[PDB]
Design an enzyme around this catalytic site. Sequence first.
Site, PDB file in Angstrom:
ATOM      1  N   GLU A 357      -7.160   4.858  -7.356  1.00 16.86           N
ATOM      2  CA  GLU A 357      -8.485   4.800  -6.717  1.00 16.86           C
ATOM      3  C   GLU A 357      -8.104   5.571  -4.966  1.00 16.86           C
ATOM      4  O   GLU A 357      -9.019   5.956  -4.469  1.00 16.86           O
ATOM      5  CB  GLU A 357      -8.924   3.705  -6.463  1.00 16.86           C
ATOM      6  CG  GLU A 357      -9.778   3.060  -7.863  1.00 16.86           C
ATOM      7  CD  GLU A 357     -10.744   4.170  -8.093  1.00 16.86           C
ATOM      8  OE1 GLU A 357     -11.551   4.395  -7.172  1.00 16.86           O
ATOM      9  OE2 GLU A 357     -10.978   4.341  -9.493  1.00 16.86           O
ATOM     10  N   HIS A 487     -21.019   3.844 -21.167  1.00 26.21           N
ATOM     11  CA  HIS A 487     -20.999   5.213 -20.628  1.00 26.21           C
ATOM     12  C   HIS A 487     -22.245   5.936 -20.980  1.00 26.21           C
ATOM     13  O   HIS A 487     -23.142   6.291 -20.256  1.00 26.21           O
ATOM     14  CB  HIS A 487     -19.865   6.315 -20.573  1.00 26.21           C
ATOM     15  CG  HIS A 487     -18.688   5.843 -19.866  1.00 26.21           C
ATOM     16  ND1 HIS A 487     -18.621   5.950 -18.567  1.00 26.21           N
ATOM     17  CD2 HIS A 487     -17.344   5.643 -20.295  1.00 26.21           C
ATOM     18  CE1 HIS A 487     -17.238   5.613 -18.130  1.00 26.21           C
ATOM     19  NE2 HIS A 487     -16.498   5.394 -19.431  1.00 26.21           N
TER      20      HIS A 487
END
Lengths: 596, 248, 50
Positions: A357, A487
């Site tokens: 990240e 998703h």
Amino acid sequence: STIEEQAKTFLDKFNHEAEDLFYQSSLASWNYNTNITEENVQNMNNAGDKWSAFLKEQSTLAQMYPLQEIQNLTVKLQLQALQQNGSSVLSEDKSKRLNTILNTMSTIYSTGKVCNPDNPQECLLLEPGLNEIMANSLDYNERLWAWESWRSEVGKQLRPLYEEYVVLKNEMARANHYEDYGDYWRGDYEVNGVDGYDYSRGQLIEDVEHTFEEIKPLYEHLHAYVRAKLMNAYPSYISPIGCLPAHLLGDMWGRFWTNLYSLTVPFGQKPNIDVTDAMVDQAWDAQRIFKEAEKFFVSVGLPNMTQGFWENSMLTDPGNVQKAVCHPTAWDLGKGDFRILMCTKVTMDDFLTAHHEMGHIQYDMAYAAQPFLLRNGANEGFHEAVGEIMSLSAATPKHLKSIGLLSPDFQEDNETEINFLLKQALTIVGTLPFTYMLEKWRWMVFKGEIPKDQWMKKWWEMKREIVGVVEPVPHDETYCDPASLFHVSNDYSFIRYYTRTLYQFQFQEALCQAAKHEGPLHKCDISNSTEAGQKLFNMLRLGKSEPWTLALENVVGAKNMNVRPLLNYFEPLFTWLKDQNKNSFVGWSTDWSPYA
Amino acid sequence: ASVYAWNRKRISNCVADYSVLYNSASFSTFKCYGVSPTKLNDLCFTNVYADSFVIRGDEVRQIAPGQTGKIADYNYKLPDDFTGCVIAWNSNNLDSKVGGNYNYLYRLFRKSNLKPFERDISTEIYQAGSTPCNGVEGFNCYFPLQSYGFQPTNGVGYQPYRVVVLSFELLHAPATVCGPKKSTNLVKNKCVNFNFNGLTGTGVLTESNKKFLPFQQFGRDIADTTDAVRDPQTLEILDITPCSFGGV
Amino acid sequence: GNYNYLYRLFRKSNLKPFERDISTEIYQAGSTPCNGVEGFNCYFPLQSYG
Ligand SMILES: *[C@@H]1O[C@H](CO)[C@@H](O[C@@H]2O[C@H](CO)[C@@H](O)[C@H](O)[C@H]2NC(C)=O)[C@H](O)[C@H]1NC(C)=O
Ligand SMILES: *[C@@H]1O[C@H](CO)[C@@H](O)[C@H](O)[C@H]1NC(C)=O
Ligand SMILES: *[C@@H]1O[C@H](CO)[C@@H](O)[C@H](O)[C@H]1NC(C)=O
Ligand SMILES: *[C@@H]1O[C@H](CO)[C@@H](O)[C@H](O)[C@H]1NC(C)=O
Ligand SMILES: *[C@@H]1O[C@H](CO)[C@@H](O)[C@H](O)[C@H]1NC(C)=O
Ligand SMILES: *[C@@H]1O[C@H](CO)[C@@H](O)[C@H](O)[C@H]1NC(C)=O
Ligand SMILES: *[C@@H]1O[C@H](CO)[C@@H](O)[C@H](O)[C@H]1NC(C)=O
């Protein structure tokens, strides 16, 4: 008195107005994910409504500018994104079904329930309840119960709702002069206005399909090997002549096969590379997690993190009353504000996620000099693939031995690298056919050349071909099991994960060739190479200002989507798999032959 | 004041200490263009007009002679060969507030470029196209004045850096005000060089019984020979005499 | 730009004329010394004309 000078005036006005409103909405959304209160939900909805209404006014004003005389490409890309009407074409009676439907789906999906009917003992949420029963247990009977504990209690109330959703949102594209709603998502890869450099929307389908004929022979040998090391736990329950059950592939959907590493370890006799017990004896704190990460980037050549991140973000789990969710997401608040939102743990995955990240943050400030409308990635796959190339390098045994975590005398034989490489093969190669097929199914229901009675017969016929599962009992049309995944329900483009792998390994070979590494790609490293920094930094600063097809010519010199520099990473694994599969029947068709 | 309403106050008839600014250990863009920090101490320049305004952190470098951009073109234009220095320091802890400090504005759009040393404060709105705007917002009015947002959590580039500009120039006006010259220690009864406020010489010090009026500085006795000085630092009288000399 | 002829930009002290000043030393204007790492006050004198 020209339209060209009038557009630069409007975009200069919009850039300062939007970045003030976007920072207020992003700061409110940041506080919702750290300090959950009753008023904070209202605080987020207040800022998010005025930000969406701000784009409605700016989209109408940019419509009157004609697009047939702007020779400049930097403002042409800005006007194409700003002029997306979206919901303004729809009527008032039709715009109210958007905010009502999308908020009911999110609240329904947040309800975790695995309590068995007629036996109400207890059931926990997804993170404490569902993950322990799928990652640790080895019982066939209860996992079969768990498959109907989610596919018969949540997806049953979506069948009248999701079918109404896919017949009217597809009609908006013709009102916006697009082909279909599937073609609308291909506008991010669409390049227009340059002679000889144009990339058609339909060329992505042809290039993707041409690259799929070399992924398949790698995946045939991976599935054949894993079915022999899975039958040890289930001796008489699966036959080693066919395919695998769906509820034994790591996840509910079989997207990630990470939980099969313990069951299908190649050589478990020698101990694995694990230093989790070593750091807790010497008391390693979370201050030290980000300090070694910062000096890694400045040794490469990338700029270090700013001073407005260490005193602003949170690191440990604070307090007792703060029950905020820390799902791994990347935050771009704008105006130089960059934050990392995660719950730290002393584990293998959280240390790698800390590296994964941060790479998106280093990409986000790279195009900080670009205007706000161009302050984004080149496409949807660049911003995700850039954050994963450093995860491959940090997991190498050479980098682990470089810092000093591993023992100074740790031999590197054949079996110490195949065990690590097969874990990466199960999480990268195994998810490529599953990611492309689902988006291919989504394309036909969005194009509209699929009748109501032909939803299931096309969805099921690829499960028989790719996955290979015969239905144990016939099922009718009232189920709505394809809309259950996270998703597809939350409006995320899933094509960005298929192009993520082919980008994160095109760049890996380009930077390793720049560093002049003598050896294979698995042992390659990026650090201590200022030559590698100019290759990444030349393409990071582009943003959306240049076409993405010029970014490929900036790294590999081939204008098309190359698939060749992916098989070269797995040549050590494929040649061993070819010798292990000397007598097995490799490559299955649909097969009712043995047990007809 | 903001960049579009920068004030211009005249500094004269006073003493300015440039040494304290050097060792402040707080500035971030302490740069001098066309002049050295050392050469402005012994000698000074009059016309010390000072300009004060707020500049965003990322665009501080735009404010310099020979440097073009956005703020330097429409808000504050510096003349070529500007003999001055720019001093900037952070103001995060005081020039910011939660929720956004919407008090600092700037001029973004201007029909014509700003000439050096000209302040343009006006409420007239911009004309992007040809249709006039009669005060009603339209598709080509584009109200120029915009307000910056300085939140406490903003990045380093967007922080409002506190910057001031000093201008040094020589017009025909005489009698400038100069930086102070360090003093020394006292020495008694020695043939030592001295440089008082205007005059210099060499000689020995001796007591005198006579007294002088309090509104003189020095004096001479016979044939333009300076023989009396009085420093105002201590309000005590010391009289100079030439020291011994002759032919061997 | 013919970047082959260079020149000295700053020097701390005035030297005796008809003397060669061939040195790569960096100017020292501010109080913070420079130890071979370019900074805000090192002022590398050497420059090439165009
Ligand atoms: C990359 O560069 C770093 C920095 O020089 C190397 O770290 C040094 O490694 C040697 C031998 O392992 C140590 O003696 C030094 O003390 C280390 N430097 C510091 C500052 O601690 C690192 O080894 C290099 N990478 C590789 C693969 O050699
Ligand atoms: C954090 O949340 C608690 C309640 O959950 C609230 O009392 C407190 O004021 C919040 N603090 C901040 C800084 O948001
Ligand atoms: C249009 O203007 C921008 C402004 O910088 C420039 O970068 C770009 O090259 C121009 N396009 C053409 C085709 O000249
Ligand atoms: C957007 O809406 C406006 C007003 O209804 C219309 O004139 C324009 O053609 C629309 N553009 C698109 C791309 O739908
Ligand atoms: C970050 O990088 C800058 C420029 O290289 C440097 O001046 C600064 O000291 C670095 N920050 C830290 C904490 O080392
Ligand atoms: C790896 O396998 C090859 C082929 O069998 C063998 O020659 C080699 O010795 C093995 N590696 C080690 C470290 O023994
Ligand atoms: C200036 O003269 C006065 C005499 O009244 C004296 O008290 C003062 O100390 C002098 N200034 C300095 C800096 O010594």
